[PDB]
Each structure stands twice: as structure tokens, then as C-alpha cells.
Amino acid sequence: AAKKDYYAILGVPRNATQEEIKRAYKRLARQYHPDVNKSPEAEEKFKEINEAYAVMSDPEKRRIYDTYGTTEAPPPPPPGGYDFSGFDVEDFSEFFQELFGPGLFGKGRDLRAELPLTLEEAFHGGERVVEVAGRRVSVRMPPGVREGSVIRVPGMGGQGNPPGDLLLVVRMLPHPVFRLEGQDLYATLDVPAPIAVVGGKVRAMTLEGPVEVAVPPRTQAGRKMRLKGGGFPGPAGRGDLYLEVRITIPERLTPEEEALWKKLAEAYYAR
Amino acid sequence: AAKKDYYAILGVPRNATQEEIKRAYKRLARQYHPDVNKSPEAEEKFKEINEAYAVMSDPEKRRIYDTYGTTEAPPPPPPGGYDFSGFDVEDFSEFFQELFGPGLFGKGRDLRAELPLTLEEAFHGGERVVEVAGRRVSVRMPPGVREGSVIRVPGMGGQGNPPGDLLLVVRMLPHPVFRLEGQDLYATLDVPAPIAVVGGKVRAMTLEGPVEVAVPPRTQAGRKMRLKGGGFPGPAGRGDLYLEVRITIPERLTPEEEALWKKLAEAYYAR
């Protein structure tokens, strides 16, 4: 209740410098430290010294204390609260609690947020700047990150003593062409009917870019083709790419091309 | 309330034999039977005879009727109760309800079972014979009956006064070709590539039978074609059939056919 004299406790004058306070703390802390001084009186003196230094080491906190009493009631807290890092704040005197209490909060809560990513964003990974309701955060993201993968950004959660963690959970945006299942990718490969019969090379697509795919002679619709290592990356191994063959036909032709298609069609009505 | 004379209703002497009661029932049952006698008076008379015979036919039940009213040893109804299977017990008089009431069981438990049906079986509906627990049961069935549909067969449940009900739930067996969704049907239509380009007729399938489906010129794979009313029937409406076009190519060809396919293929590598 009664205003503690932190200056008397550290044995420094009312107008001491910060370094004067620092060295006074060092001198007195080594004097009353639990494992150097095994006295019952030393426990309380050490506690006092730590409380004194906790307030006086910060110029901002030192000023609050200096201008307390003339203005009777405790002052409004700063945004966020008071930061007494490396100080057992719960063990300090009642005077302290009355004075700094309004801005002494408990363990900060974690914030859990979704990280909506496109197949190619998650595939590459790398550095992503994330703005999720509250703060701007940059994080490293492993190549081939999946749905429900947790990215912990420590200290970026809720405000408190200490602050909480940001927990980002990856969500996968549906893709126009590819379909993810585990580490494997699945896509439809359009193969022109003549190329399917004879067997040639079609231009297909991967997330890395476009590749050439050789289709064997007489490959039917629904034939699944594996491109080893063309799927999602992973720590222990890489997934594959599966292309499902989809026979395609020309929606437009030249009068010359009609003659060829007509002969085949007639041979089908024959069979 | 008053003691009914069952001997007077059946037309038998006070000390008749069990065979004499049986033949007197047959004589009077065929005289006042529902479908042979269309009289309003025959309704009560036939109910009277049914009440009499039910009591009189069983020697244990008949003795109970004979020894009722007198100031002798008062017998509580037997541990097993009274068996009146095949008689509208509640419909009977109160005199019957007072003497046999304590030995009667309540309405029987419902028997619950699954009715596994194929798409074609569910499509057509009608009369079905089913085995549940031990017995066979006939059951009418609406065309286009669906998954989870309840078919209450009254009086075909557990033993009781009256018996309970059979409750069947329709389960749909998976089909090799058709897929049900609501009342709509879905299936894959194989279409030879040359027919898809030029446009012609393909032999498609329904649950009724096979049909001809006219395919327009230049119809791409994935084109979905509605066959009105070709789906599942129902009250107030009929489902559609949807056939998804799947372009097919020949797995075997003639040396003459190779040349036609080879030309188009080389015109595609050129494109």
C-alpha cells in the first residue's frame, strides 16, 4: 500500500542514471543471490532488489513510479500492457500490483487462422507474407505443404505475459485442372482420337510447367499414365502424377478431312 | 357383463365333445362367413361364433368357462397366459374380456428388417415374397421405390393381441452400369470417335431395354445427354436418364483401316 522507495532499496540517489541503477543491481544481486547467500533474510531482500530493478531499469516504467502519488490513483496502461520480461511479476509487492496491475495481463491466448493456398503455392512453398486479422507475419513454408498442416509462428498470437503463438492451418483451394490426393496429383489428358490409335506425343501439363507425353499405339479412353515424381514434394519422398486419358475429337474440319472420317464411320455401320 | 351361453351360440348340448364343437363351428362359420353371406346381421353372428369357438375349442379354456361364476376354488389365469392366435380379441364382448383379460398379451412388437433390391427390381415394383426371421411374407411395392423407403406390412410382426407390423427398409444394391441420384439415372455411353465427328446413331441402354440415341455432329467427350422420363418413376413425376459421352477407339483394325488413322495423326503432328 505505502509507496516503496526503490531508490533506497538499490542504494542509489533520487536522480541516478540508468547505468548507475544497472551496476547497483549487479552489485546487490550477487550479494543476496539464493545460492551464494543461504540466509532467510536474503530471500526477501533479493525479491525487493528484483522488484526495484524491474521498475527502474525501464525509463518508461521509472517515470510512472516517479510521477505516482502526486496523481493519487494508478495511471492508464499502454496499448498491449507492461512488459516485465525475465521478472517473476506475481511474487512482487502489493504496491507494485496496485501501480502496474491495470496493465499486467496473464498468459496470452493462441490465435488459430486458416491459410488458403493454391496447389502451386503449396507445391513451391517458400516465403509467404500473411496478413490474418491482427498482424503482418512472414513465415517459411516447406515445399509440398498439405491441408491441415500447422505452421507455428511463435509469439505472434494474443497479447499477454508472455504473448501467445500464431497457429496457421493450411487450407487447399480447389484447382481447375489438378486434384490432390496424398502426395499424388490427378489430371485429365486430352488426347486426339487419331493420335490415340496410331500412338504419338501429346503436350500435357504439370505444376512445374508443360511436358511432352508419349502415348503408345492403341491406347483406350480411361488409361491412367504415371509420371514418376511429377506430384507433390515431401520430406521423405515425392508423389507422382496420374493422367487419365480422355479421347478428343475435332469440332471443326476442312472438306478434305470430312472424307476420311466418313469412310471410317461407314465401316462401323458395316460391323 | 352377464355370462354368455357359448353352447347356445354354437347349437351344442351342455356336455358336447370337442369334435362336436369343431363340426358345429364349421357348419355355422360357412353360413355366416363374410364373402358367402352379405348380411348386416351376419356380422355380429359370425363374431359371436368366433368368440365361442375360441373359448370352446381349447379344453383348458372351456373348463375355465364352465367353472366360472360358482363359489368354488378361485383360479388365477395360467403362468403362460392364453393363446388366442387368429382371433380379433379386442372386438369380442366384455364378458370374454373379463375372464381372459388377465392372461392376454398386448399388441405384438414390430419386426424390423432390410429389403435389398436391385435397380431393376426397385424400378418395376409390384408383388414380392420375402423371408424375415422365419416366415415368408407377400408385400406390394410401389414402382420406383428408393433407399430408406419404409414398407409397413400390417399384422405380420410379433405375436400379440393384435400382432405387430413388419417394417421393411429398402436398401439399394450397387449396379454395374447405372447410378441413382434422387430419381435421376446416370450412365456412361461409349461412342466410337468417327460417329462422334460425323454424327449418327448409337445403341444405348435403359432399365426398360436398349434404345437408339441420335448423336449430333461434332459432339465432344463429356457431353451429357438427357433422355426424358428414362429415370426412376415416382408419384407426381418421373426421373430422367443422363448419358455421359465417352469417346471410344478400336482395339483391333484391318491393314486398310491403318492408313485412314495414320493420315489424320500426321495432320495433327503438323498442326
Numbering used by the authors:
A (entry chain A), B (entry chain B): 2 to 272
Text lifted from the article:
The electron-density map of this structure inspired a third construct, this time of a complete DnaJ from which a disordered stretch of seven amino acids (108–114 in the linker between the GF domain and C-terminal domain; DnaJΔ108–114) was deleted with a view to increasing conformational stability. Therefore, a full-length construct was prepared that lacked the 108–114 stretch (DnaJΔ108–114), which was shown to be functional in refolding assays. The subsequent substitution of four residues with methionine (construct DnaJΔ108–114/4M) allowed SeMet-SAD phasing, resulting in the determination of the first crystal structure of a complete functional DnaJ containing J, GF and C-terminal domains to 2.9 Å resolution. In all four monomers in the asymmetric unit of the DnaJΔ108–114 crystals the orientation of the C-terminal and J/GF domains differs, showing that the Δ108–114 deletion does not restrict their mutual motion. Moreover, the J/GF regions of chains B and D showed poor electron density, also indicating flexibility. Since the J/GF domains visible in the DnaJΔ108–114 crystal structure each assume a different orientation relative to their respective C-terminal domains, it seems likely that this flexibility is, at least to a large extent, concentrated at the junction between the J/GF domain and the C-terminal domain.
